[PDB]
């Protein structure tokens, strides 16, 4: 299958017009939001199990962040 990888962002710069807005953290969060609504039941399951089992607030927050970021791309 043809697999053209996306062009790198920071290597070229200028002040002329750019073709399109590049990927960004806001785009990432928007995609996560889009995924969560479709997979809410699993979302609640994953959040509740970790929040119950783990002991530390910061650790739980970190794991939740990592899981949410990793969920949609695949």
């Amino acid at each position: 299958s043809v697999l053209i990888p996306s062009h790198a962002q920071g290597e070229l710069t200028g002040r002329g017009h750019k073709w399109l807005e590049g990927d960004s953290l806001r785009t990432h969060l928007t995609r996560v939001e889009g995924w969560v609504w479709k997979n809410k039941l699993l979302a609640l399951a994953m959040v509740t199990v970790v929040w119950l089992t783990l002991e530390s607030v910061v650790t739980r927050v970190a794991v939740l962040v990592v899981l949410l970021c990793l969920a949609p791309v695949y």
Partner: protein, 494 residues
Amino acid sequence: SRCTHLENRDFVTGTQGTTRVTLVLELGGCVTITAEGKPSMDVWLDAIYQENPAKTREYCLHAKLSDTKVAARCPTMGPATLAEEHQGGTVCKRDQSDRGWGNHCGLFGKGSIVACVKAACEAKKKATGHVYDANKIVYTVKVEPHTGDYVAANETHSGRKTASFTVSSEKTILTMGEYGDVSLLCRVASGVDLAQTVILELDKTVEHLPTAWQVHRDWFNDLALPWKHEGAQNWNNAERLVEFGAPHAVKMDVYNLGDQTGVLLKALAGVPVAHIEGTKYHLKSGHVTCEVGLEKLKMKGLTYTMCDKTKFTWKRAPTDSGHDTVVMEVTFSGTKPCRIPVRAVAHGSPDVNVAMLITPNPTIENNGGGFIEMQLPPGDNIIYVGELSHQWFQKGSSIGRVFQKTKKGIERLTVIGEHAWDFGSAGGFLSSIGKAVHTVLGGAFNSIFGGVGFLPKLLLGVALAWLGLNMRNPTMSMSFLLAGGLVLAMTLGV
């Protein structure tokens, strides 16, 4: 003055005895040079282009298939063979398939089958790349005398001049009439790194799509698509667009994965645009470093008489500019050649003149005009032209102006990197140390994280901060935490 037509205007001011100044000229930007006793000048970079550039390998985007052939042989009679398998312009695949008395053979088992198809590229679905030659590239710089006339953006100023630099270009002098000569020396090869830029042409005929892109070479040379050079007649790796289904006993199907234009344009998201005009290929981004020599400039009309205090009238009342300046235009009735008396005073202190003119020694001439541009301090002011008077509230603040200039400095660093340390500098330790430290640090950081991307880079920054937290001994724990924070901050800022 063309500089009023755009944002991204920069003011550079010399001092008496300053022979020449260094500028970095950028597409879509311009600088006004002011000197303590010499007329102001407008300098900008108009085009970076080449005529009929050299080509590089072309890629196909929509395969055309024809004349499929298939052959097969029984489980023991050896592998299948087909004539087209050794020719050019053909894609072939050979595999095993089940056989048995259900088909007209002697045994049950895995036989052999081979299929072939002629492949080509459809009429207008081929991407083609061009690369620049350092000995032929042309830079065009333009300079305008900043006369008191005003001319719209679609209309041509009678006084501006052009300098077309190439690798074979010396220091050049532009006359521009009574104001005297100005000199320019632009260092080709100080600008765009032509060794890693490719101009990608897709099809300059379609209506609603830009006519070219400026893609990176390390990205262009690895691309899963059929490719060939200009003179070749047959495509390489046509197998990347054709697919083959699982075989039946005596047949298998040939599939086409269709037009890739939509996935290509999705990949190109962040790339800057370029342009085509007949035989000319233009970049619409980049910069060049150039030294401008002010030595032989003269002020016009220094020996003219002063205009009458009366007999002036407005033509456009004072108005606010985009750059925290005031712009105005006056008309005069009388013996034409003369100097305009222009001044401005803070409200309630008529003894002190506070105007700083961008146009020194304004004049009215036999067929010229009375455009004026000023900078005034914040607050309530009066503007006088002869006996014409007008009140003016200047919005903003000194802290605001300092903030604006600092912000623009940060943006120039972000956009052109270490070259920023050359802008308007007279030389010396500040520029030297800044450029050395910047070049070394940027080189190292680019070496490690060059192509990794925003979010992966941020994630690695978080990982580094976490590692600094995890490391048991406090002092390097804190040092590594600071390193992680710095990488996070920089990858977020850029």
